[PDB]
Design a protein around this motif. Structure first.
Motif, PDB file in Angstrom:
ATOM      1  N   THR A   1       0.819  -1.204   0.000  1.00 35.20           N
ATOM      2  CA  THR A   1       0.000   0.000   0.000  1.00 35.20           C
ATOM      3  C   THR A   1       0.856   1.258   0.000  1.00 35.20           C
ATOM      4  N   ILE A   2       2.087   1.156   0.506  1.00 33.75           N
ATOM      5  CA  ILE A   2       2.937   2.325   0.706  1.00 33.75           C
ATOM      6  C   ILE A   2       3.308   2.987  -0.619  1.00 33.75           C
ATOM      7  N   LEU A   3       3.317   2.232  -1.722  1.00 33.61           N
ATOM      8  CA  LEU A   3       3.498   2.844  -3.036  1.00 33.61           C
ATOM      9  C   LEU A   3       2.172   3.337  -3.604  1.00 33.61           C
ATOM     10  N   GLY A   4       1.150   2.482  -3.582  1.00 33.79           N
ATOM     11  CA  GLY A   4      -0.134   2.875  -4.129  1.00 33.79           C
ATOM     12  C   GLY A   4      -0.616   4.191  -3.562  1.00 33.79           C
ATOM     13  N   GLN A   5      -0.298   4.456  -2.295  1.00 33.04           N
ATOM     14  CA  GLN A   5      -0.752   5.706  -1.710  1.00 33.04           C
ATOM     15  C   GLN A   5       0.027   6.888  -2.254  1.00 33.04           C
ATOM     16  N   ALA A   6       1.297   6.703  -2.614  1.00 39.79           N
ATOM     17  CA  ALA A   6       2.008   7.776  -3.302  1.00 39.79           C
ATOM     18  C   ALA A   6       1.408   8.020  -4.679  1.00 39.79           C
ATOM     19  N   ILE A   7       1.017   6.943  -5.360  1.00 37.23           N
ATOM     20  CA  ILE A   7       0.403   7.085  -6.674  1.00 37.23           C
ATOM     21  C   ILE A   7      -0.907   7.856  -6.570  1.00 37.23           C
ATOM     22  N   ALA A   8      -1.704   7.573  -5.535  1.00 35.48           N
ATOM     23  CA  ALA A   8      -2.949   8.313  -5.335  1.00 35.48           C
ATOM     24  C   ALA A   8      -2.676   9.745  -4.884  1.00 35.48           C
ATOM     25  N   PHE A   9      -1.646   9.929  -4.061  1.00 37.17           N
ATOM     26  CA  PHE A   9      -1.329  11.235  -3.505  1.00 37.17           C
ATOM     27  C   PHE A   9      -0.938  12.223  -4.593  1.00 37.17           C
ATOM     28  N   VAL A  10       0.054  11.873  -5.416  1.00 34.29           N
ATOM     29  CA  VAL A  10       0.511  12.844  -6.408  1.00 34.29           C
ATOM     30  C   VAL A  10      -0.592  13.174  -7.403  1.00 34.29           C
TER      31      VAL A  10
END
Lengths: 52, 52
Positions: free
Chosen positions: B6-15
Motif C-alpha cells: 500500500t505504501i506505493l499505491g498511496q504515493a500514486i494516489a497522492f501525487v
C-alpha cells in the motif's frame, strides 16, 4: 461619489467664475459713477472761478 | 503493524490528488478572489481622485 465629486467641483467653479466677474464689473460701474461725478464737480468749480 | 505494498499505491494516489488541485483548483479559486481584492481596493483610490 466618484461622479458627484466632479459634479460639485464643476458647479463650484461655475459660481466662482460668475461672481468674480460681477466683482470686476461693479468695479468699473463704480468707476463710471465716480468719474462722471468728477465731471460735474469740475464744471461746477469752473462756474465759480469764472464769475470770481 | 504490518508493512505493506500500500505504501506505493498511496504515493500514486497522492501525487494525482495533488495534480488535480494544482493546475485546476487553486489558480481559479485565488484568481477569482484577486479580482474581488482589487475591486474593493480600487474604491479607495477612486474616492481619492474624487477628493483631489
Amino acid at each position: 461619489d466618484l461622479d458627484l465629486a466632479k459634479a460639485s467641483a464643476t458647479d463650484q467653479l461655475k459660481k466662482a467664475k460668475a461672481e468674480a466677474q460681477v466683482i470686476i464689473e461693479q468695479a468699473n460701474k463704480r468707476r463710471s459713477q465716480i468719474l462722471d461725478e468728477a465731471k460735474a464737480e469740475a464744471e461746477q468749480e469752473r462756474t465759480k472761478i469764472v464769475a470770481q | 503493524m504490518n508493512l505493506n505494498a500500500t505504501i506505493l499505491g498511496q504515493a500514486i494516489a497522492f501525487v494525482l490528488f495533488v495534480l488535480f488541485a494544482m493546475k485546476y483548483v487553486w489558480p481559479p479559486l485565488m484568481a477569482a478572489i484577486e479580482k474581488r481584492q482589487k475591486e474593493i481596493a480600487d474604491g479607495l483610490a477612486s474616492a481619492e481622485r474624487a477628493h483631489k
